[PDB]
């Protein structure tokens, strides 16, 4: 059980009709932002729009990242959710545009669900069935193959098309060890057995137990793949001794700008498959925090990328005011985002906290960290948070607990928090020390 | 399984009589062999007087 600045956040604490409770899901306050994020979550679960962009703005330590993590939690692990800091797009190997497109495509998911019919079990016996030749001939003619299968509680003999004979011949099936066959496609797969495992003195052949239940089996298999996986698998080779495989193994295959033709082919085949009802599309979420670090070129490419028809929903986080956009020196914009992109997305405000909210936050964080604090020190911690910062009070909890445990105590008292104040400083006191000292400090 | 000081005993047809001894300080016993076991043994030949190791995980017999 390890905690790191989070894991006390479980959802938005919403309710039917989309009204946020004051205290729910590890959340206090921020009612309007939680309601807006719930509306966004409903829009995501609708799975109809494409390329909808929201930017949530506010001051530092105001729960900007917690909101995105909460909506990711509410959406569920099934839907894709790609987190990204703005400084990750600058890659040495590939241009920033292709990396942005790769992360853009990684948020779209596809679920493949399908059924299979299986006859799996331990071979009882196998025999060809001689029959009259359909044409004039002088020799044995096999019209069926009888294979008997026994598993736990089940047994059944089957007559099969003799042409499948080679499938046994290639599979080295033997008799009585294992078998596992598909129903319609034909062919056989050899999955020895525990019935003869101890019979031999020693053998380098693996043994599997008797399959459970009826020999005939219905199996439903479901998996999920992001479109980026399909593109990278289509582009990248596979195999054994082929020259291309040797070239790939000997070259350290750094990333390459995948062409648009491959993406279009993948899109076409995926559309064909979802037309047949075997696959389903699941748009995801692309979360980018600290967008102020993005260059103007990335913003311009995002302008075009958001207008595609297979775009995911992109959420952006920023904590800047009137700032110059990176890559330029004469454009000054709110949140460090160019106005043309700002015109394309929806703003979500975020307000600072009050002292009582800070006290509740500290109490909840102390409870989630397995610590006990009474009011006589909780009030001092709240005053510290209101004076220095909320994050400073949040960080000071663990040293206080360690100091309490050192003195063979269990409860955090005023002395422990005062000693932690003396030992560890905040930013303001550090700057005050820096200014008043003239020894290269 | 370690301590394969064997002095193998292999003479039907197709390299029949699949048996070999195994000795150590406190144990000594004779093991019969299967077709796949001898097929593995013929590759990486054991001189019947060399300490060799082998796992029961149906894997590879390792020269020591």
């Amino acid at each position: 059980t390890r905690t790191a600045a989070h894991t006390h956040i479980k959802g938005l604490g919403l309710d039917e009709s989309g009204v946020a409770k004051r205290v729910e899901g590890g959340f206090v306050g921020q009612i309007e932002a939680r309601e807006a994020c719930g509306v966004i979550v409903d829009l995501i679960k609708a799975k109809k729009m494409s390329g909808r962009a929201i930017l949530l703005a506010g001051g530092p330590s105001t729960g900007k990242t917690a909101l995105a993590l909460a909506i990711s939690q509410e959406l569920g692990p099934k839907v894709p959710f790609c987190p990204l800091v703005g400084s990750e797009l600058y890659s040495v190997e590939v241009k920033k545009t292709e990396t942005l497109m790769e992360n853009f495509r990684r948020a779209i998911g596809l679920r493949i669900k399908e059924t299979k019919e299986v006859y799996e079990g331990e071979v009882t016996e196998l025999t060809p069935e001689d029959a009259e030749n359909p044409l004039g001939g002088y020799g044995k003619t096999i019209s069926h193959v009888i294979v008997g299968l026994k598993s736990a509680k089940g047994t059944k003999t089957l007559r099969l098309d003799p042409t499948i004979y080679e499938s046994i011949q290639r599979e080295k099936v033997s008799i009585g060890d294992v078998i596992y066959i598909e129903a319609n496609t034909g062919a056989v797969k050899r999955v020895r057995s525990d019935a003869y495992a101890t019979e031999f003195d020693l053998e380098t052949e693996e043994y599997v137990p008797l399959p459970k239940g009826e020999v005939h089996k219905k199996k439903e298999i479901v998996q999920d793949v992001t479109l980026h996986d399909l593109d990278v698998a289509n582009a990248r080779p596979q195999g054994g001794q082929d020259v291309i495989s040797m070239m790939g193994q000997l070259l350290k295959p750094k990333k390459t700008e995948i062409t648009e033709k491959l993406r279009q082919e993948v899109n076409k085949v995926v559309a064909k498959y979802i037309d047949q009802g075997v696959a389903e599309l699941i748009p995801g979420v692309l979360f980018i925090d600290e967008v102020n670090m993005l260059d103007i070129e990335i913003f311009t490419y995002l302008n075009k990328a958001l207008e595609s028809n297979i775009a995911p929903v992109v959420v952006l986080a920023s904590n800047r005011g009137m700032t110059t956009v990176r890559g330029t020196e004469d454009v000054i914009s709110p949140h460090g985002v160019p106005p043309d992109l700002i015109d394309r997305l929806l703003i979500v405000r975020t307000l600072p906290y009050d002292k009582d909210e800070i006290r509740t936050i500290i109490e909840r964080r102390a409870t989630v960290e397995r610590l006990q604090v009474e009011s006589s020190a909780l009030d001092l911690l709240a005053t510290m948070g209101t004076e220095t910062s909320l994050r400073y009070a949040l960080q000071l909890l663990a040293p206080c607990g360690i100091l309490a445990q050192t003195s063979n105590r269990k409860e955090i008292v005023v002395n422990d928090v005062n000693e932690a104040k003396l030992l560890f400083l905040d930013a303001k006191r550090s700057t005050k020390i820096l200014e008043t000292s003239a020894n290269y400090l | 399984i370690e301590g394969e000081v064997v002095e193998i005993q292999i003479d039907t047809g197709g390299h029949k009589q699949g048996k070999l001894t195994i000795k150590t300080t406190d144990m000594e016993t004779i093991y019969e062999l299967g077709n796949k076991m001898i097929d593995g043994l013929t590759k990486e030949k054991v001189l019947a007087g060399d300490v060799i190791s082998i796992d029961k995980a149906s894997g590879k017999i390792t020269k020591l």
């Binding site: 196998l126 025999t127 060809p128 001689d130 020799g139 044995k140 096999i142 004979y165 046994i168 011949q169 080295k172 099936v173 033997s174 008799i175 | 039907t12 047809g13 197709g14 390299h15 029949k16 699949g18 077709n35 001898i38």
Partner: peptide
């Protein structure tokens, strides 16, 4: 002509246990 049983079934029987196993079966 069939030298020994159904030849396909013959080789099936051979790969049931193996050549050496077939020799030592008796």
């Amino acid at each position: 002509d069939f030298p020994n049983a159904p030849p396909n079934l013959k080789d099936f029987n051979t790969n049931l246990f193996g050549d050496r196993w077939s020799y030592t079966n008796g």
